[PDB]
């Protein structure tokens, strides 16, 4: 409920606060909670056209079953560490959210799985405000009536297989709370740049030595900082992805970032090495110098291999480390 | 039997480049054979006041 | 005092600390004139005031006390006196010298 | 002050982040102060209001004493009164006013301590320490005229902190009829018992029960007619100047941040507060109530009802006065207990030295001797006991000058009873100890546990035992405060003030190494109070990314500067890689040799020459509580029982086959509650048994959080701002 | 509070209830809560004349201080296991309750004592109904607001000595509760004979090897069952009394058991031997045969020393054992 | 009980003929309470034991 | 430290230097003594366990 006031206060339309009233899981029912909330999202927000279009404008790709189809039951259900590096700027907040739940449902079809860890990062100011909406959504989806909190991971079971999940939502509201030791007055600026480096500050101070095996990439708002290629590049440097990590890049809009991205991921080692070098030469200034991009520059020696591509949506897997 | 007033050795940094405050003190401990110990006191270039 | 006790000891001579200044000198005895050792003046650098002590001796202002003090030195076998004090404190020592 | 608010024009100037550089080691005020005079008149307050509205000032923060806050309170009451000749009205209709108590007095209600009070107390102690630091003369007396117009807190605390014979406070004034004769009694009583350094403390507001003031000259005359050569020492303006002490630096910085928060967190529904401190916790009390409560103490005194006034003072004041009165009356013989009830008390110093050891041992010896108990000091810890049987009996005269002296007069070391229990147990039996006080650190905590555990193997150890935590690290479980830690913070702040001054073609950045064990408390506290850029601690990770970030802050800080000199606080046990030496070395090579980095190692100087007033006051509170515990008759052998001398020494007897405790009468001979850690939790003194504390503690020499020290320090240095852009 | 309702049910006068309602102590005064109850008791019940006559009719004996009279400060303060074997018929219920309180205060004048255990037996119908009222008073007198119950010892600190006590009220209601296993229904008859033997059954089962050092005898109701001498003989028999026990026997009225008690106690060994045998020849019948008076016949081989006498108030002490 | 008894020339009288123990004999062990045995040995300051 | 003391010796008489072969001590190829013994002992190991 408190979220409903927070939403009105953050210029967000009442629809959201209105959904959190009509939103309730049946529990006892044959249909798994994630799927219930998922279908409720489609109805309230009329996500039938936009989903269809998102497929249509991407050469009729199965935007409902991107994982399910590509991978076999084993492959999809072996994935345990997932990073969702934002929300697309090409889809509505309810379509973006829905897709989170839909990707989640996809990895939880089986009753023969080890636990799942899902990290959603809401990087810009556009999506950032919906953290609490998403948190109340994931709470109902998993049914955390096992043992919500102002901060922290939401743990419960999920999908057709009741697979134990632990959903983590990294945003600036949680980052501010952290920095001020949970003080009431969290009203201060925080640039998207600062936010990326603080996420890392947390990975290194929290200790986490687990590898991401499915990396979800898109076109987020604030591309100067939240640049797809630049995020991949960073994760490559920090040795954060599994040696056979899958990199999914979804979106509708094709731009230069996507060209730069694809030419890097699919580029020969000599191309990647130069890609990196010339960026540093062309873009590094003594004032620019400190930015994370100048430190965590990527690695040309990481090979990828194309797995899937239906116009604007692609899957590449890391295929080797030349040394 | 006597008053316990404490013991000091003052070593100007320039007295020895090899036998340094820290080295000197470790030699004292080695030679002391548990009968007493040695500790350094290095305040630094703060002595200006 | 630490310096006098040690210097005198090093130069091979018995050092006596006259407690309560002139009062101690006039009254005399083991009570006020104590033999001091090298280790007895340990860490006196840090100590404030006077561990020996000072006292205003009314008797030493007269020839009555000046004589009594003189006897006490010869009885204690003290061959030399070192006064550490102020103006009158040293003028009185100077008068004791001529007398 | 208010003069600039009334003539508000060029008197209202903006402050930049760089304008307040190095103010944590300055004092008094760079903004300047003024007496409440034209703000006493309505037309003056009206003009002060206009200036705020005109200059678009929406919030006011008043840092002052009783008078300044009474004014702030009256300005808020009279604010809804806005005369009109404009959007300005609706905008500035609701005054946002917050109050900070900047007062040496410590008069203000609702707060346990005001900004400046402990620093002023330090100035008094500074002076009386010189008076005390001379070898005693046969018939000498000293009178200290202390400032503080409205409250006897400074007078009282100085009394405890200096071991004064008599004190004069407005809260409990003596009879006009016989104060001189009572002064004479008290003094000569102590002089009889060996005291040659008769000290009396006269407060600024000192009076007799008929409201007549008591001058220090009046007091001098009393002592002179007792045959004592008396010397008045008037502190004067000395008590208001100088750098704030360790606690004040913390208190003002923390309350200052909250004042800004309180402004932001405001609405007309939420009342105008006074940023106060209660159980070491910052609290927001209402200005209205605090000014009102403080007026009722002034009223009580003026009304000659000094009982209402003393009752109107916080427990802090009450417990302190009770302690001063207790210690003073130990010479009475009123504390004396029957011959049968007299015990042999042992005091041991376990751990590295702290200046707080001698004052604590002093109070414990006097408390015990007052009851007729025999005090035995185990010289040079457990090793001294084991190797040489080094026990020394203490008497009223032995205690002399210990309230001022640092380190240990009996010797302190980290040796443990483990070294030879049998030998420790042999000696405890020979000297027939009926109670033990282990003053020290983690090893004093360890020894208490070891001896408690040995109760099984060695009946002689089944006596009440306690650990009085004394350590610079603040690493002992069972307390929030360890004796000697405040002295250390004071020693460190002062040390760093000299560092930043020498950092003004010599040096730029300093890596000051803090030796606070395996706990980041010392380093964190020191960081806040010294305005350190970065603080290195075992609790927070050090790596190539963290280091690069620290270098970036230092780099971005220096490329703005035009008083300078920066510091980093490195805890001795933070990284086995990134040491004080490596951190300093990386700073030096940074910016292609941009700045000159230097290391500083105060080290063993952290114990200090003399214990601070906080240390002196607490050493006395806790020593009293230790003695009260071990010497409690409930934990001692019962005298109306058919007990043999050996049965009373073994503390058990066999009754009709059943082994019975000569104390409890219970079948279980060993009571786990008798081996306790005496510490502070909030304001209250707590007694906690070792067995329970020992399962709780870590192998990293001990759950506990001081996070907000690091949060506030990072906000005030560039850190939090650089970390968020 | 339940007690007031209970007293109205047992036919008891309202006085007792009204006493409990106005009965209040304050451990914020120098006077101990025991002296405070004692004061309230001497007030509400007008026990001054009764106490005055109690003494004046026992050759003016100090009834207000009988222990403080004989014993010295040590002597009295060592005593730690008392047995008050019923109430006196010659004293009004409140007068007896004061006597229990007056006795407790004497044994707790010092702060150097080992804890006291006081047992009080309520051996007949005329006193057993008062047990909860007594237990409530002792509770206030001792102040067990430290850490009431329908059963169990009342722990606390009593007297000017502030001595730790543990008061035990061994009555029929309590014995029934034990027998039924704390079932609600306790309305069944219990013989005064049956009661004594069950008290013995509790002791023999608890395994208590702590010896009685003060034994308080008197003129109880059911002189046929609660015979002062018969009670002595049973404790003499069971090795329940300390080697140097103290037997204090009081009353105003004089009877034959008083003649026979003093003749037994003060009797030569040959006399006691004959006394026992002649009771057994005279009174043993095959119908009576199983009674405890024919099991625990007493011990002729014991010795007493008359320590104090003032008209029907006597104190003897076990002086010796001949084996 | 701390049951220690000092013996003298006179105490020894008639013991060369007598059976059993005049001081008492039993199979109890110091194990029962070493600390108490050790306390007593220290009090009576025993320099030898049979 | 030994090298440092040698250097300052003779008021800076000779130039002292440290050398740390270290992990190179294992060698590129085993010596003939090592080859011959490795064979003798391996044979004796097998003969024992088998």
Curated annotation (Swiss-Prot), chains A, E:
It is found in: Cytoplasm. Keywords: Cytoplasm, Glycolysis. It comes from Komagataella pastoris. This is ATP-dependent 6-phosphofructokinase subunit gamma. GO terms for cellular component: cytoplasm. The gene is PFK3. CDD domains: PpPFK_gamma. It comes from the Eukaryota. Structural subunit of pyrophosphate--fructose 6-phosphate 1-phosphotransferase. Not required for catalytic activity. Fine-tunes allosteric regulation of the ATP-PFK by ATP, fructose 2,6-bisphosphate and AMP. Pfam families: PpPFK_gamma-like_C (PF22457). One of its GO terms (biological process) is glycolytic process. Heterododecamer of 4 alpha, 4 beta and 4 gamma chains. The gamma chain bridges the N-terminal halves of the alpha and beta subunits. Disulfide bonds: none annotated. This subunit is only found in some Pichia species. Pathway: Carbohydrate degradation; glycolysis; D-glyceraldehyde 3-phosphate and glycerone phosphate from D-glucose: step 3/4.
From Swiss-Prot, chain B:
Beta-D-fructose 2,6-bisphosphate 1 binds at residue 39. It is found in: Cytoplasm. Beta-D-fructose 2,6-bisphosphate 2 binds at residues 13, 45-48. It comes from the Eukaryota. Catalyzes the phosphorylation of D-fructose 6-phosphate to fructose 1,6-bisphosphate by ATP, the first committing step of glycolysis. Heterododecamer of 4 alpha, 4 beta and 4 gamma chains. Belongs to the phosphofructokinase type A (PFKA) family. ATP-dependent PFK group I subfamily. Eukaryotic two domain clade 'E' sub-subfamily. This is ATP-dependent 6-phosphofructokinase subunit beta. It comes from Komagataella pastoris (Yeast). The gene is PFK2.
UniProtKB/Swiss-Prot annotation, chain D:
It is found in: Cytoplasm. One of its GO terms (cellular component) is mitochondrion. Residues 330-343 are annotated as: Interdomain linker. Beta-D-fructose 6-phosphate 1 binds at residues 103-105, 147-149, 204, 237-240. Beta-D-fructose 6-phosphate 2 binds at residues 140, 231. Its cofactor is Mg(2+). ATP binds at residues 35-36, 65-68. It comes from the Eukaryota. Beta-D-fructose 2,6-bisphosphate 1 binds at residues 414, 471-475, 515-517, 572, 604-607. Its EC number is 2.7.1.11. Residues 344-725 are annotated as: C-terminal regulatory PFK domain 2. GO terms for biological process: canonical glycolysis; fructose 1,6-bisphosphate metabolic process; fructose 6-phosphate metabolic process. Mg(2+) binds at residue 66. It catalyses: beta-D-fructose 6-phosphate + ATP = beta-D-fructose 1,6-bisphosphate + ADP + H(+). The active site is at 105 (proton acceptor). One of its GO terms (molecular function) is ATP binding. Coiled coil: none annotated. Keywords: Allosteric enzyme, ATP-binding, Cytoplasm, Glycolysis, Kinase, Magnesium, Metal-binding, Nucleotide-binding, Transferase. Pathway: Carbohydrate degradation; glycolysis; D-glyceraldehyde 3-phosphate and glycerone phosphate from D-glucose: step 3/4. Heterododecamer of 4 alpha, 4 beta and 4 gamma chains. Catalyzes the phosphorylation of D-fructose 6-phosphate to fructose 1,6-bisphosphate by ATP, the first committing step of glycolysis. Belongs to the phosphofructokinase type A (PFKA) family. ATP-dependent PFK group I subfamily. Eukaryotic two domain clade 'E' sub-subfamily. This is ATP-dependent 6-phosphofructokinase subunit alpha. It comes from Komagataella pastoris. The gene is PFK1.
């Amino acid at each position: 409920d408190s979220i409903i006031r927070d939403l009105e206060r953050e210029n967000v339309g009442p629809e959201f606060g209105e959904f959190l009233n009509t939103l309730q899981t049946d529990l006892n029912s044959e249909k798994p909670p994630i799927e219930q909330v998922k279908s409720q999202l489609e109805t309230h927000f009329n996500l039938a056209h936009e989903t269809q279009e998102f497929s249509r404008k991407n050469d009729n790709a199965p935007v409902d079953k991107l994982l399910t189809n590509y991978y076999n039951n084993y492959e999809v259900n072996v994935l345990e560490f997932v990073l969702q590096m934002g929300f697309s700027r090409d889809l509505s907040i309810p379509l973006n959210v829905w897709f989170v739940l839909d990707m989640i449902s996809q990895l939880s079809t089986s009753k023969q799985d080890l636990p799942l860890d899902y990290y959603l990062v809401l990087n810009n100011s556009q999506t950032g405000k919906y953290s609490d909406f998403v948190r109340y959504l994931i709470y109902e989806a998993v049914g955390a009536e096992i043992h919500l909190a102002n901060r922290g991971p939401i743990r419960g079971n999920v999908g057709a297989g009741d697979r134990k999940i632990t959903f983590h939502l990294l945003c600036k509201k949680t980052a501010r709370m952290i920095l001020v030791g949970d003080d009431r007055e969290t009203d201060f600026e925080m640039s998207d740049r600062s936010f990326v480096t603080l996420l890392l500050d947390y990975y290194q101070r929290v200790g986490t030595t687990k590898k991401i095996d499915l990396l979800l990439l898109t076109n987020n708002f604030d591309t100067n900082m939240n640049n797809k290629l630049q995020q991949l590049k960073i994760l490559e440097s920090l040795n954060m992805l599994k040696s056979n990590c899958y990199v999914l890049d979804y979106q509708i809009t094709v731009d230069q970032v996507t060209a730069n991205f694809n030419s890097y991921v699919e580029g020969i080692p000599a191309f990647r090495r130069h890609e990196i070098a010339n960026f540093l030469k062309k873009r590094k200034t003594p004032k620019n110098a400190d930015e994370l991009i100048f430190k965590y520059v990527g690695r040309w020696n990481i090979c990828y291999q194309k797995k899937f591509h239906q116009g604007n949506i692609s899957i590449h897997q890391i295929s080797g480390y030349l040394d | 039997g006597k008053t316990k007033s404490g013991r000091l050795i003052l070593k100007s940094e320039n007295a020895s480049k090899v036998l340094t405050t820290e080295v000197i003190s470790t030699i004292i401990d080695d030679e002391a054979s548990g009968r007493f110990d040695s500790k350094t006191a290095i305040p630094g270039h703060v002595q200006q006041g | 005092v630490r310096a006098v006790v040690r210097a005198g000891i090093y130069k091979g001579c018995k050092v006596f600390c006259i407690h309560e200044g002139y009062e101690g000198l006039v009254r005399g005895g083991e009570k006020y004139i104590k033999e001091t050792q090298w280790h007895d003046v340990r860490g006196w650098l840090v100590e404030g005031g006077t561990n020996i002590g000072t006292a205003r001796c009314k008797e030493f202002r007269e020839r009555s006390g000046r004589l009594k003090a003189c006897k006490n030195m010869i009885d204690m076998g003290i061959d030399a006196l070192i006064v550490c004090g102020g103006d009158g404190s040293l003028t009185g020592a100077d008068r004791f010298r001529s007398e | 002050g208010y003069t600039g608010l009334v003539k508000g024009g060029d008197m209202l100037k903006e402050l930049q982040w760089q304008d307040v550089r190095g103010l944590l080691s300055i004092g008094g005020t760079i903004i300047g102060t003024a007496r409440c005079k034209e703000f006493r008149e309505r037309w003056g307050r009206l003009q002060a209001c206009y200036n705020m509205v005109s200059n678009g000032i929406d919030a006011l923060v008043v840092c002052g004493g009783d008078g300044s806050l009474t004014g702030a309170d009256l300005f808020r009451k009279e604010w809804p009164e806005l005369i009109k000749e404009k959007e300005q009205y609706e905008t500035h209709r609701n005054l946002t006013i917050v109050g900070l108590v900047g007062s040496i007095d410590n008069d203000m209600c609702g707060t346990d301590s005001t900004i400046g009070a402990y620093s002023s107390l330090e100035r008094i102690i500074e002076l009386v320490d010189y008076i005390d630091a001379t070898a005693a003369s046969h018939s000498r007396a000293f009178v200290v005229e202390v400032m503080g117009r409205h409250c006897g807190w400074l007078g009282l605390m100085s009394g405890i902190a200096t071991g004064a014979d008599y004190i004069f406070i407005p809260e409990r004034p003596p009879s006009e009829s016989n104060w001189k004769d009572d002064l004479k009694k008290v003094c000569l009583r102590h002089r009889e018992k060996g005291r040659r350094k008769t000290t009396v403390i006269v407060a600024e507001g000192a009076i007799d029960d008929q409201l007549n003031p008591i001058t220090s000259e009046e007091v001098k005359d009393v002592l002179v007619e007792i045959g004592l050569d008396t010397r008045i020492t008037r502190l004067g303006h000395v008590q208001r100047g100088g750098a704030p002490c360790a606690f004040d630096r913390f208190l003002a910085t923390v309350q200052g941040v909250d004042a800004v928060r309180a402004v932001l967190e405001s609405t007309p529904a939420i009342p105008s507060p006074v940023i106060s401190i209660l159980e070491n916790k910052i609290v927001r009390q209402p200005l209205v109530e605090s000014v009102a409560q403080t007026k009722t103490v002034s009223a009580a005194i003026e009304a000659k009802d000094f009982d209402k006034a003393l009752q109107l003072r916080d427990q802090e004041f009450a417990t302190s006065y009770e302690n001063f009165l207790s210690v003073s009356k130990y010479d009475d013989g009123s504390y004396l207990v029957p011959e049968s009830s007299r015990l042999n008390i042992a005091i041991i110093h376990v751990g590295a030295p702290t200046s707080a050891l001698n004052p604590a041992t002093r109070v414990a010896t006097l408390n015990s001797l007052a009851k007729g108990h025999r005090v035995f000091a185990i010289r040079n810890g457990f090793a001294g006991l084991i190797r040489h049987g080094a026990v020394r009996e203490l008497n009223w005269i032995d205690v002399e000058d210990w309230h001022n002296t640092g380190g240990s007069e009996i010797g302190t070391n980290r040796s443990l009873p483990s070294d030879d229990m049998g030998t420790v147990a042999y000696y405890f039996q020979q000297y027939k100890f009926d109670g033990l006080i282990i003053i020290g650190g983690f090893e004093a905590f360890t020894a208490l546990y070891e001896l408690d555990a040995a109760r099984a193997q060695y009946p002689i150890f089944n006596i009440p035992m306690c650990c009085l935590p004394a350590t610079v690290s603040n690493n002992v479980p069972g307390t929030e405060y360890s004796l000697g830690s405040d002295t250390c913070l004071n020693t460190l702040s002062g040390y760093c003030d000299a560092v930043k001054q020498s950092a003004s073609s010599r040096r730029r950045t300093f890596v000051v190494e803090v030796q606070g064990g395996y706990s980041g408390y010392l380093a964190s506290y020191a960081g806040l109070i010294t305005g350190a850029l970065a603080v290195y601690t075992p609790e927070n990770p050090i790596n190539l990314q963290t280091v690069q970030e620290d270098i970036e802050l230092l780099t971005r800080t220096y490329e703005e500067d035009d008083r300078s000199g920066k510091i980093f606080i490195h805890n001795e046990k933070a990284s086995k890689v990134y040491t004080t030496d490596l951190i300093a070395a990386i700073i030096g090579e940074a910016g292609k040799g941009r700045f000159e980095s230097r290391t500083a190692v105060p080290g063993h100087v952290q114990q200090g020459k003399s214990p601070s007033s906080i240390d002196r006051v607490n050493a006395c509170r806790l020593a009293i509580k230790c003695c009260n515990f071990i010497e409690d008759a409930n934990f001692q052998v019962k005298h109306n029982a058919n007990l043999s001398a050996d049965e009373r020494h073994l503390r058990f007897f066999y009754d009709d086959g059943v082994k019975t405790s000569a104390v409890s009468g219970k079948s279980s001979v060993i009571d786990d509650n008798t081996s306790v850690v005496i510490g502070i939790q909030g304001s209250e003194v707590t007694f906690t048994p070792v067995k329970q504390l020992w399962e709780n503690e870590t192998h990293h020499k001990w759950n506990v959080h001081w996070e907000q020290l690091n949060i506030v320090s990072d906000l005030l240095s560039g850190r939090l701002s650089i970390r968020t852009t």
